[PDB]
Design a protein around this ligand. Structure first.
Ligand SMILES: CCc1nc2ccc(OC)cc2nc1O[C@@H]1C[C@H]2C(=O)N[C@]3(C(=O)NS(=O)(=O)C4CC4)C[C@@H]3/C=C/CCCCC[C@H](NC(=O)OC(C)(C)C)C(=O)N2C1
Ligand SMILES: [Zn+2]
Length: 197
């Protein structure tokens, strides 16, 4: 018992910049600082933007701010706290059935507005700052206009699906794949977030 380890915090290690005319990834913390911040849960780095790149000791993925909550996937974060300037912050939402978790949105983050457009022309934002056109095919499914190998989508779970007007439509959850090629995506609808809240 005395030698039992604690899992570390999720750590924001960068962001996807969507503020201007060009989307691009920025790293804000390197691997050493990340490992150490994971252990302490103390992250004093300034946070900006809607889409964060996050990491544990073992995985890296994305997290998206919507309505004052920083949302990501349970298969990434598990029940982990997130590092903040005042120490580890406990999850405010946890739903393993939806593969969804959430913490209060960090100071300096900006939140996306939930979509009410009723539109099916969507855009997936990846951890490499690619903006991929996606046609909505159901409540939780969208098809890639141009299929990609799953390699291209790996590490982008927790990322947003956006409508043409930049509203959040959903959170990227899983890739629908055949023979290693992603032809569609599964996402957590923003309504399901709104209900979870
Ligand atoms: C309902 C899903 C779910 N839900 C889960 C809910 C709870 C839970 O608890 C541990 C685990 C869950 N795992 C779950 O599924 C796991 C997790 C997840 C997954 O892989 N998600 C992605 C990702 O990038 N993840 S990540 O790298 O960033 C990781 C976080 C660091 C999105 C991108 C995928 C890239 C290609 C990866 C090939 C795997 C194909 C798979 N497809 C498949 O599942 O498709 C369907 C749904 C059509 C069958 C699939 O996508 N996934 C499998
Ligand atoms: Zn919209």
């Amino acid at each position: 018992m005395a030698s039992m380890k604690k899992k570390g915090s999720v750590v924001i290690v960068g962001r996807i910049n969507l503020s201007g005319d060009t989307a691009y990834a920025q790293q804000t913390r390197g691997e050493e600082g990340c490992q150490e911040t994971s252990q302490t849960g103390r992250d004093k780095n300034q946070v900006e933007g809607e889409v964060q790149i996050v990491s544990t000791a073992t995985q890296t993925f994305l997290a998206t701010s919507i309505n004052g909550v920083l949302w990501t996937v349970y298969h990434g974060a598990g029940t982990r706290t997130i590092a903040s300037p005042k120490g580890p912050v406990t999850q405010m939402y946890t739903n393993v059935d939806k593969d969804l978790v959430g913490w209060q949105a960090p100071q300096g983050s900006r939140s996306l507005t939930p979509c009410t457009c009723g539109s099916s022309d969507l855009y997936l934002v990846t951890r490499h700052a690619d903006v991929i056109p996606v046609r909505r095919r159901g409540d939780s499914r969208g098809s890639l206009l141009s299929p990609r190998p799953i390699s291209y989508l790996k590490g982008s779970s927790g990322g947003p699906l956006l409508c043409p007007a930049g509203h959040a439509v959903g959170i990227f959850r899983a890739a629908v794949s055949t023979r290693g090629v992603a032809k569609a995506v599964d996402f957590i609808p923003v309504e399901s977030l709104e209900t979870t809240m």
